[PDB]
Design a binder for this molecule. Structure first.
Ligand code: FES
Ligand SMILES: [Zn+2]
Length: 406
């Protein structure tokens, strides 16, 4: 009986718009502006957006619900966090880790090191960011934070469709950001919302179909935000004037269903029949399955453990990179494979049964060594999970859990 990974979602402070525009609003628009009554955003405002206080409060709430806190995924919401002052960012993350640890460390590195064997393990850290705010520097900082997953605010993959954030972004930005995120071994999720102004159900469906056929994209998951008119927002005005008309409930539901119907086996759908990862969660003993698909000039290998009824027991994402962007310093070769995710259902492995993870990793190492002739494997693990990989011969190098293939 193993306990699930509990989400700890916190928001950063209201920030000015990343771009310079006299017409732009006082503060940068967040997706959460259209989910205002969410517990986490209201909680965020009630804490004056203090990281430590938010995390401590969240931990207390989760503990009071009777839910486990031994495995935690930190989620940094806002989408504009990486555009803030550097000191603020590092101090925020450090505050989060301090709140998880129960002790105040002398630095971020010490906080992470401490969290490696703390009670509240941070087995994952997810950061929301905009496609145009996701370059090499931002990514390196995210590595410094101990980031394992990124949610890109794509919203919808078309330049002529109005976004819910100010200014907006381009498809090329999404492509570049996705490429860079993959090349650094991060998990990539897209914020996906049908019903945006200037679109149509047919267009949303077509784009939803294209996002899984074009090698530039193909995210690990979609976060479905059914677009709707929220009072106190600009969309409300757009609806008053008649400039925007939302889909009927049956239309939206049908569209969501059609979207779920066309997703590849390696995709996980979550809402803010379906044959995705989440709708196969969990007869016969599971066997090992492999599914390859091209992405960002590299190869993606989706390994999984599934039984005769196609029920999913575990999965591993192994990337054969287009280049070696992570610097690992001589000891680990010029060509290195990346394990972007290891998930033995329904949870994440942190401590150091559990055999499925070992088997998945073994197959990954085998494929990387024999078929693609790679020198080593690198795993961008959450800090609180590092120990697990340490029990399997991996050692910490520049934020990655690395092992030389032999
Ligand atoms: S209002 Fe500032 S960019 Fe559209
Ligand atoms: Zn599903």
């Amino acid at each position: 009986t193993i306990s699930g990974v509990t989400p700890v979602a916190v928001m950063t402070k209201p920030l000015p718009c990343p771009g310079k525009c006299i017409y732009c609003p006082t503060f940068a628009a967040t997706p959460q502006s259209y989910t205002p009554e969410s517990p986490a955003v209201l909680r965020a405002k009630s804490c004056e957006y203090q990281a430590y206080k938010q995390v401590a409060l969240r931990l207390r709430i989760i503990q009071d619900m009777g839910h486990p806190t031994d495995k935690v995924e930190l989620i940094i919401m806002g989408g504009t966090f990486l555009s803030a002052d550097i000191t603020y960012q590092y101090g925020f993350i450090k505050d989060c880790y301090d709140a998880l640890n129960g002790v105040v460390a002398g630095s971020l590195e010490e906080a992470k090191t401490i969290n490696e064997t703390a009670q509240h393990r941070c087995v994952g850290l997810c950061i929301e960011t905009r496609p145009d705010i996701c370059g090499k520097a931002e990514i390196q900082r995210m590595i410094d934070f101990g980031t394992t997953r990124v949610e890109l605010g794509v919203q919808m993959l078309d330049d002529d469709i109005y976004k819910l954030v100010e200014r907006g972004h381009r498809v090329s930005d999404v492509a570049e950001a996705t490429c860079l995120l993959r090349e650094y071994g991060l998990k990539v999720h897209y914020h996906w919302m049908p019903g945006l102004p200037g679109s149509s159900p047919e267009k949303d469906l077509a784009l939803s179909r294209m996002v899984f056929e074009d090698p530039r994209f193909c995210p690990d998951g979609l976060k479905l935000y059914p677009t709707m008119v929220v009072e106190g927002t600009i969309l409300e005005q757009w609806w008053k004037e008649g400039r925007y008309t939302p889909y009927p409930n049956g239309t939206m539901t049908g569209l969501i269903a059609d979207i779920k119907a066309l997703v590849p086996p390696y995709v996980r759908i979550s809402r803010v029949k379906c044959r995705c990862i989440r709708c196969r969660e969990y007869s016969g003993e599971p066997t090992l399955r492999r599914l390859d698909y091209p992405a960002s000039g590299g190869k993606e290998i989706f390994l999984s453990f599934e039984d005769a009824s196609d029920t999913l027991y575990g999965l591993l994402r192994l990337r054969i990179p287009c280049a070696s962007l992570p610097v690992l310093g001589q000891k680990y070769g010029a060509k290195t494979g990346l394990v972007r995710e290891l998930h033995v259902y329904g949870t994440e492995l942190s401590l150091g049964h559990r055999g499925l993870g070992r088997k998945l990793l073994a197959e990954a190492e085998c494929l990387a060594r024999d078929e693609f002739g790679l020198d080593s494997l690198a795993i961008l693990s959450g800090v609180g999970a590092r120990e697990y990989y340490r029990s399997l011969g991996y050692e910490l190098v520049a934020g990655y859990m690395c092992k030389h293939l032999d």
